[PDB]
Nucleic acid binder design. Structure first.
Ligand SMILES: [K+]
Ligand SMILES: [Mg+2]
Ligand SMILES: [Mg+2]
Ligand SMILES: [Mg+2]
Ligand SMILES: [Mg+2]
Ligand SMILES: [Mg+2]
Ligand SMILES: [Mg+2]
Ligand SMILES: [Mg+2]
Ligand SMILES: [Mg+2]
Ligand SMILES: [Mg+2]
Ligand SMILES: [Mg+2]
Ligand SMILES: [Mg+2]
Ligand SMILES: [Mg+2]
Ligand SMILES: [Mg+2]
Ligand SMILES: [Mg+2]
Ligand SMILES: [Mg+2]
Ligand SMILES: [Mg+2]
Ligand SMILES: [Mg+2]
Ligand SMILES: [Mg+2]
Ligand SMILES: [Mg+2]
Ligand SMILES: [Mg+2]
Ligand SMILES: [Mg+2]
Ligand SMILES: [Mg+2]
Ligand SMILES: [Mg+2]
Ligand SMILES: [Mg+2]
Ligand SMILES: [Mg+2]
Ligand SMILES: [Mg+2]
Ligand SMILES: [Mg+2]
Ligand SMILES: [Mg+2]
Ligand SMILES: [Mg+2]
Lengths: 72, 175
RNA sequence: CCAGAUCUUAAAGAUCAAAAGGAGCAGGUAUCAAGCACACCUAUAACGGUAGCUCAUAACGCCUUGCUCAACCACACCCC
RNA sequence: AGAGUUAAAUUAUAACUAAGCUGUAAAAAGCCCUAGUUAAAAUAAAAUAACCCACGAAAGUGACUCUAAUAAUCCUGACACACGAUAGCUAGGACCCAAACUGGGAUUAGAUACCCCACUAUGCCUAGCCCUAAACCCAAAUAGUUACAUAACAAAACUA
């Protein structure tokens, strides 16, 4: 019967939900690490825009927000 | 928005003769005072079409149906303002607007003269459907703001270049 | 569509065809979804004015690669 | 979706009597501030009707009353707009009762399980979020035909 496939998917999900719990703080470090590079790479993309347009400095009053930051 | 007067006979008990000779008691029992919201809508719909429509006896016309939907749309908005957490009526309000929006587009492509009069009288503002419906996330709206601001700054750099630098060359000519 | 080069001669015919342009057709990938000035008007060939242009029928990116064959496109040590 | 309301049960609580009361296949633990009877708020949940099959787009809804009310003159349509049981999160309020976790008892070689007792998150109301299900009638929407014709099984087969 099809139960031979639901059980196989049950064990994999049950083992994955223990791999996250055992190494929860390892994922916390990596997630924040990827978020910093995500923000930094976004800054370089905006920095490329104004440099190629001929300007020397970013337009006055423009401070790039940290979109990938925890807020509410 | 419209406000039907309170002391008015309901739609049905109007054309029958010999009403004004009746005492105030029966007139009170037939006025909008002792009638629920349903009878109020009839008076709103009856008055509204007689002010904007050309031929009131025609119900199958697109303009007549648009007037009918507008009465329901206004009624739903009044209900929504009171019961804010109601979700069944909020869905009805959105679908009623979409149906009126669809019918206004159909009227525009067939009879422009009538469409202009309907749009002006009812206060409806017809906006063309914007192409490429996309979800404006924070990254896109931020980068779009920068590009527009950089574009304005480039204009100032060139505009002052057109003024000062040309004048400096013209200074040699003028002396 | 074709300037220009060359040949012939009665200066108007022909051979090759740059640049520019488009009815249509044209590898893989959307886990590349937004590109960021990519539009236009006036007269000037300036200035001034409008705030637009391309894109889920695949723009903008990335990877692989000569070809649709009387032949065609490209390179001539490297820094297009 | 709002506003108002309560029949049956249960509990705080009081009186009276009794010495035991709960619990299991059998026991222990727990209680003795208890049990039975009479009187009785709040909170929560909605017997029989239902052998009925109605309403909504779906998830859902079946104690009573009132108000508001169920798009389109009646095709298809997304990554767009709106919604989405239960569990879970944030803040305040409620807490009869049920109850993950936890503690005790028993069983067992072990039982951090089934069984018994106690109690918490929580199930509840107001405001916000999360957007997941065997979200399954595993059968997409709109018009139709009973012709042709049985892989199997199931809820017969098919055309635009
Ligand atoms: K009941
Ligand atoms: Mg596996
Ligand atoms: Mg050419
Ligand atoms: Mg020529
Ligand atoms: Mg010539
Ligand atoms: Mg990948
Ligand atoms: Mg070279
Ligand atoms: Mg409510
Ligand atoms: Mg004992
Ligand atoms: Mg007692
Ligand atoms: Mg109490
Ligand atoms: Mg049923
Ligand atoms: Mg429907
Ligand atoms: Mg309906
Ligand atoms: Mg549709
Ligand atoms: Mg939910
Ligand atoms: Mg819940
Ligand atoms: Mg909850
Ligand atoms: Mg949290
Ligand atoms: Mg809480
Ligand atoms: Mg509790
Ligand atoms: Mg309890
Ligand atoms: Mg134990
Ligand atoms: Mg269901
Ligand atoms: Mg499914
Ligand atoms: Mg379905
Ligand atoms: Mg469909
Ligand atoms: Mg339908
Ligand atoms: Mg059908
Ligand atoms: Mg057989």
């Amino acid at each position: 019967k099809n139960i031979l496939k639901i059980r196989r998917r049950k064990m994999n999900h049950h083992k994955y939900r223990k791999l996250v719990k055992r190494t929860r703080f390892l994922r916390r470090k990596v997630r924040e690490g990827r978020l910093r590079q995500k923000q930094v790479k976004f800054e370089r993309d905006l920095k490329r825009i104004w440099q190629k347009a001929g300007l020397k400095e970013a337009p006055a009053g423009w401070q790039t927000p940290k979109i990938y930051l925890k807020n509410q | 928005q419209d406000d039907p007067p309170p002391s008015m006979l309901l739609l049905d008990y109007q054309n029958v003769p010999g009403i004004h000779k009746v005492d105030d008691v029966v007139k009170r029992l037939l006025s909008l005072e002792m009638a629920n919201q349903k009878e109020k809508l009839k008076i709103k719909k009856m008055q509204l079409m007689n002010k904007v429509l050309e031929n009131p006896e025609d119900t199958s016309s697109l303009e007549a149906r648009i007037v009918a939907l507008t009465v329901k749309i206004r009624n739903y908005e009044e209900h929504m303002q009171k019961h804010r957490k109601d979700k069944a009526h909020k869905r009805f309000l959105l679908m009623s607007i979409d149906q009126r929006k669809k019918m206004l587009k159909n009227l525009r492509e067939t009879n422009y003269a009538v469409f202009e009069k309907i749009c002006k009288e009812l206060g409806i503002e017809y906006t063309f459907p914007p192409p490429y419906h996309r979800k404006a996330h924070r990254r896109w709206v931020t980068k779009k703001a920068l590009c527009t601001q950089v574009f304005r700054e480039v204009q100032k750099l060139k505009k002052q270049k057109r003024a000062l630098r040309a004048a400096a060359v013209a200074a040699h000519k003028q002396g």
